[PDB]
Amino acid sequence: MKADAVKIADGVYWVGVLDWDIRMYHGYTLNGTTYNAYLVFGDDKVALIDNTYPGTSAQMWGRIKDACEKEGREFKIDVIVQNHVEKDHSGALPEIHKKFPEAPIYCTEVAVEGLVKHFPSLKGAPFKVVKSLESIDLGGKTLTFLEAPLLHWPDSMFTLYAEEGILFSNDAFGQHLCFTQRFDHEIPENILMDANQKFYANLITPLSKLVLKKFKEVIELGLLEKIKMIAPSHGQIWTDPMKVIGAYQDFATGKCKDKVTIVYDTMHGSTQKMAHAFAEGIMSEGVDVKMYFLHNDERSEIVKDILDSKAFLLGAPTIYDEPFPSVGDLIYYLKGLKFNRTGLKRLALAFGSMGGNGGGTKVLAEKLKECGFEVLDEYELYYVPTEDELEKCYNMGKRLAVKVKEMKTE
Amino acid sequence: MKADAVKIADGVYWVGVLDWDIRMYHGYTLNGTTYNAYLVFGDDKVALIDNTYPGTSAQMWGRIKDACEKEGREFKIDVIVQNHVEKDHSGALPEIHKKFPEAPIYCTEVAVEGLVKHFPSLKGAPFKVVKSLESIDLGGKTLTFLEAPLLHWPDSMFTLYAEEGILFSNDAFGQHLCFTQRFDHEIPENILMDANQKFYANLITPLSKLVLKKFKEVIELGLLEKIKMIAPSHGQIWTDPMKVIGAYQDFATGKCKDKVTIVYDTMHGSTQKMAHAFAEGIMSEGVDVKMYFLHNDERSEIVKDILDSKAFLLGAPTIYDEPFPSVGDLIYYLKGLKFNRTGLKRLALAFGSMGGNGGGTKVLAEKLKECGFEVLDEYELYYVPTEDELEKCYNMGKRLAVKVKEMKTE
Ligand SMILES: Cc1cc2nc3c(=O)[nH]c(=O)nc-3n(C[C@H](O)[C@H](O)[C@H](O)COP(=O)(O)O)c2cc1C
Ligand SMILES: Cc1cc2nc3c(=O)[nH]c(=O)nc-3n(C[C@H](O)[C@H](O)[C@H](O)COP(=O)(O)O)c2cc1C
Ligand SMILES: [Fe+3]
Ligand SMILES: [Fe+3]
Ligand SMILES: [Fe+3]
Ligand SMILES: [Fe+3]
């Protein structure tokens, strides 16, 4: 298919793929995304940095062809860089190798085995293992590699185009957005940063300590000031790299708002009434509230709002001695994300209605603790809340909101 | 339920309902909304303006009680205003009347029949039919009524509190947003105006000519300069009324961007490949694209983007001589919304794949014309597009984008 490349610097093009139609990936929702791949034209060698998901290469090849024509060059790739083995960025590597079998493939040591396990036709491909601070010369353009294990896979690495300071960061600093506009400043800031927050919350939270360590290494290497553009593998290219670095710094150190995220499920509406009553009390103190109903809403938006919330409420009715099962999905997600690794133990309350022996709230409190929250109280009641019982929820919310505002903003 | 009112002026409170959990209403999707009701404390009479959806009054009554406490007044309503009979704003009128059976109910003539048909217990209620420019005195505060038939129901009207210039406009100027923040300036502008655009597109488009007439009447009344706050029945209160009046003016006169909305469905992916190829051609001219896949996406977001798009593409495969049935839903919606009433005949193309006698694209072209679009071309092809057939889609998109940019920005 015919598809035009987008120039991002002299001799550097975006040749990625617009996945207009995807609505879910990993455990998170979205309204399309991109698989960003880049073509760098040196005097001697043309380098392709990352590629795209299996079966979506038609756009990529069209843009690569378009870029070579604009450069007056043959349709030829001399160098292949694979920052990350996950298949939304490597899925076309077998195609690329089959068309250019002599082009070396630069990747990390553990990436070789991962790529071969994904794509057995790559066994015997000219892999060239790289380590941090190693560089290849393309002819007037230099690519420098920086290893980034567990950011977000063991195989991950960054590639820096030194002369213009363009950091190809793969997933790091990406956002799941699919626009015709390619750069951060070309879309509304609120959309950009909300998507950055969702991306961090769902993929980077458990790596928060590795983020700070990598930031400390980049600073001591003197490399931070040499980064003028961050070109991630999903979403917008950052012409303001410090904006997203500052965001990651905030998220990794627990900088939160006077904000509470309330999550609940219900069968007959009683736990829902309690959840709304807790919100009224919280709002009476000027503290913000996000309200999620697990019947309708899903984990990826919930954890987005938890990321900059100082407190997290979870409620569910008791059903055969256990909390309603929908909470198990979120709890298992929170056990993997480990929000306590941001440096903050967010406050929490457990609540629900019951009709017999109860116990669901007890379980929720235990799980909220296993997930790294500081549970301050529990409240379980019988069937439909009375007027006074909703006032108790209001009072509990108010007291929580007071504590939220006294917690110092990290 | 305990719930705090929000003061919006001296002696004026928001006593509405936060519908945190609703995700669909009318024919549109949402992430919660509010049912805004307002309490006006005159020296002599307390007036409640609109109310809420049936079964959701607990918050409203809590805020009414709170407002009376803050004013040092009796828990008492002296006057009831019903701007609009639709039940998300009248659902609690039977409750309010049963509690304060002597409080007159001010509404339009045709509203009386509608409210009694909705709520038979209101037969015999102290209705007081009002007409435009009639006023009532609350004791230092005046409410002036302005009829607004078919904005958006025949029964609709606005209520103006003259001394502070607060226009209670019911659905007009509303947006489906559910935040703890009550005012326009307290949330990101992009969210506010995108929600305003969706509300207009889905509810106001066929009334575009009545909007301009009502604007012309308000101006000739010398009344536009007397409006300092627009307090709608959904979403945020406008402290900058001219911002939303300007937006309505643009939408009602066809002011669009260099933007194309593309909608398609597919069974085997061929129509999808065509849609993506049309987008590449459009983007090669710098024209924006929104891409919607009817399997995953729904009508209310589609028509939001059509509202400020200069062109609309629609594609579907042929199935037993007809286009894939999902297009029938959108077409029936566009038949009701009548985008040509904005003063603009948006450009359009019909396309799709076929496997036999075809004819689907023929049908799409006819329906796009019945819906008020200017169909420029059709393109139907056999099974999977070839390389050259995708280039034709690209070329057609490119030529369309040229015409789009030549269309004068109304
Ligand atoms: C977001 C994400 C996080 C992951 N975390 C881990 C991990 O912590 N440990 C691990 O061994 N594999 C991890 N993986 C790798 C998956 O287990 C691996 O890709 C697996 O083959 C996926 O299996 P599937 O095809 O059934 O989805 C992660 C993958 C993703 C996408
Ligand atoms: C957005 C909207 C637009 C409407 N437009 C019309 C209309 O054009 N003509 C009409 O007679 N009724 C119109 N109605 C009224 C509905 O037909 C009426 O409320 C009906 O009783 C709804 O039936 P239902 O309860 O089965 O939804 C409209 C209602 C809504 C919410
Ligand atoms: Fe990844
Ligand atoms: Fe990725
Ligand atoms: Fe309405
Ligand atoms: Fe309404």
Side-chain angles (χ1 to χ4, degrees), chain B residues 236-254:
Chain B
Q236 312 307 110
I237 294 156
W238 302 92
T239 66
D240 183 3
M242 289 312 295
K243 186 161 182 74
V244 67
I245 289 168
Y248 268 55
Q249 177 78 15
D250 293 340
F251 296 142
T253 57

Side-chain angles (χ1 to χ4, degrees), chain A residues 84 86 152 171:
Chain A
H84 179 34
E86 192 162 6
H152 68 127
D171 282 312

Side-chain angles (χ1 to χ4, degrees), chain B residues 51-57 87-92 95 119:
Chain B
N51 43 93
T52 188
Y53 192 86
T56 69
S57 71
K87 66 197 229 166
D88 53 312
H89 310 296
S90 68
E95 271 174 47
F119 316 114

Side-chain angles (χ1 to χ4, degrees), chain B residues 14 17 51 75 90 94 103 149 171 174 186 189 194 219 224 246 285 300 307 324 327-328 350 355 363:
Chain B
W14 170 91
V17 170
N51 43 93
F75 168 58
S90 68
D171 283 310
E186 295 177 313
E189 205 209 306
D194 184 64
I219 283 158
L224 182 56
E285 290 291 330
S300 72
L307 178 58
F324 192 81
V327 302
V363 175

Side-chain angles (χ1 to χ4, degrees), chain A residues 7-264:
Chain A
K7 185 187 271 177
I8 69 179
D10 184 58
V12 185
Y13 295 80
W14 170 90
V15 291
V17 170
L18 308 172
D19 196 344
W20 301 100
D21 310 305
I22 184 172
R23 299 294 173 258
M24 304 200 65
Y25 199 60
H26 300 148
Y28 54 65
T29 57
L30 46 87
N31 290 268
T33 188
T34 69
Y35 312 118
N36 297 332
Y38 306 90
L39 203 62
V40 183
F41 290 84
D43 294 338
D44 303 316
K45 302 180 193 301
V46 183
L48 178 68
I49 302 165
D50 296 330
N51 43 94
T52 188
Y53 193 86
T56 67
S57 72
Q59 281 179 42
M60 187 192 73
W61 286 119
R63 300 188 209 286
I64 289 169
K65 283 182 175 173
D66 178 63
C68 292
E69 295 180 358
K70 283 168 173 167
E71 291 295 314
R73 304 279 284 271
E74 295 181 353
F75 168 56
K76 182 172 189 182
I77 296 163
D78 300 298
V79 172
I80 304 159
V81 175
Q82 194 65 68
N83 284 311
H84 179 34
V85 305
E86 192 162 6
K87 66 199 271 189
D88 53 315
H89 310 296
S90 68
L93 187 54
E95 273 174 46
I96 299 159
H97 169 59
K98 193 178 182 186
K99 288 185 171 69
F100 306 108
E102 295 279 275
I105 303 168
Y106 293 84
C107 62
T108 64
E109 194 170 342
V110 70
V112 178
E113 201 85 337
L115 287 165
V116 172
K117 198 85 204 303
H118 275 89
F119 317 112
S121 73
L122 294 178
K123 193 168 182 178
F127 290 106
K128 281 196 179 59
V129 172
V130 295
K131 71 174 185 176
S132 293
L133 298 191
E134 290 193 335
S135 294
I136 55 168
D137 185 6
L138 302 173
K141 301 187 170 65
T142 316
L143 302 183
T144 305
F145 306 102
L146 187 75
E147 295 173 78
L150 292 170
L151 281 171
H152 68 127
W153 280 15
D155 50 85
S156 298
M157 74 176 181
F158 307 153
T159 299
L160 176 69
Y161 168 34
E163 283 81 357
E164 286 292 358
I166 303 178
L167 182 76
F168 303 104
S169 63
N170 194 264
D171 282 312
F173 316 118
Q175 347 80 48
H176 284 310
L177 295 171
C178 189
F179 295 115
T180 65
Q181 297 81 13
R182 297 268 50 78
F183 299 105
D184 53 351
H185 62 84
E186 297 177 311
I187 66 165
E189 204 214 47
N190 161 255
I191 295 170
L192 174 64
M193 302 311 288
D194 185 65
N196 182 66
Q197 184 174 322
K198 190 175 184 177
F199 196 96
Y200 191 108
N202 282 273
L203 294 166
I204 315 296
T205 304
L207 324 170
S208 290
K209 287 169 177 179
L210 300 165
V211 172
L212 299 172
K213 281 160 94 95
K214 188 60 67 185
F215 282 7
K216 192 177 191 286
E217 180 202 341
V218 164
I219 283 157
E220 283 161 17
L221 262 47
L223 279 181
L224 184 58
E225 47 263 70
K226 293 167 174 179
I227 294 160
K228 312 294 186 186
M229 175 181 283
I230 293 171
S233 68
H234 297 285
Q236 311 308 109
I237 293 157
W238 301 93
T239 67
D240 184 4
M242 288 311 296
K243 186 162 181 74
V244 67
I245 287 168
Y248 269 55
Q249 177 78 14
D250 293 340
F251 295 141
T253 58
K255 188 198 176 186
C256 298
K257 302 174 171 183
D258 289 328
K259 175 188 180 175
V260 182
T261 297
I262 302 174
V263 179
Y264 75 92

Side-chain angles (χ1 to χ4, degrees), chain A residues 1-4 20-21 23 63 180-181 190-191 264 272 276 280 283-284 288 296-297 387 394, chain B residues 1-4 21 23 63 180-181 190-191 264 272 276 280 283-284 288 291 296-297 387 394:
Chain A
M1 72 175 283
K2 195 176 182 65
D4 298 15
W20 301 100
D21 310 305
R23 299 294 173 258
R63 300 188 209 286
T180 65
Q181 297 81 13
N190 161 255
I191 295 170
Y264 75 92
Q272 176 180 68
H276 295 185
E280 292 303 330
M283 289 183 296
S284 82
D288 203 356
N296 293 345
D297 302 314
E387 220 78 51
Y394 177 106
Chain B
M1 179 176 178
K2 194 177 181 185
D4 298 13
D21 310 306
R23 300 294 173 258
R63 300 188 210 286
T180 65
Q181 297 82 12
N190 161 253
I191 292 170
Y264 74 92
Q272 176 177 69
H276 294 187
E280 292 303 328
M283 289 182 296
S284 82
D288 205 356
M291 182 76 66
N296 291 345
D297 302 315
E387 220 78 48
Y394 179 106

Side-chain angles (χ1 to χ4, degrees), chain A residues 344-400:
Chain A
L344 176 64
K345 279 189 101 183
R346 290 160 177 79
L347 310 177
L349 301 177
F351 66 103
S353 180
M354 36 114 302
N357 292 327
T361 298
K362 204 191 185 176
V363 174
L364 295 173
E366 182 190 19
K367 303 307 168 184
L368 286 166
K369 294 168 188 167
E370 293 171 20
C371 294
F373 296 86
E374 183 72 32
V375 178
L376 299 176
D377 215 327
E378 292 165 47
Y379 187 28
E380 212 167 48
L381 55 73
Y382 189 55
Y383 288 136
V384 177
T386 64
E387 220 78 51
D388 290 334
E389 289 177 320
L390 295 171
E391 185 166 15
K392 173 158 173 66
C393 297
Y394 177 106
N395 290 340
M396 289 177 68
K398 196 180 219 320
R399 291 192 301 262
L400 175 88

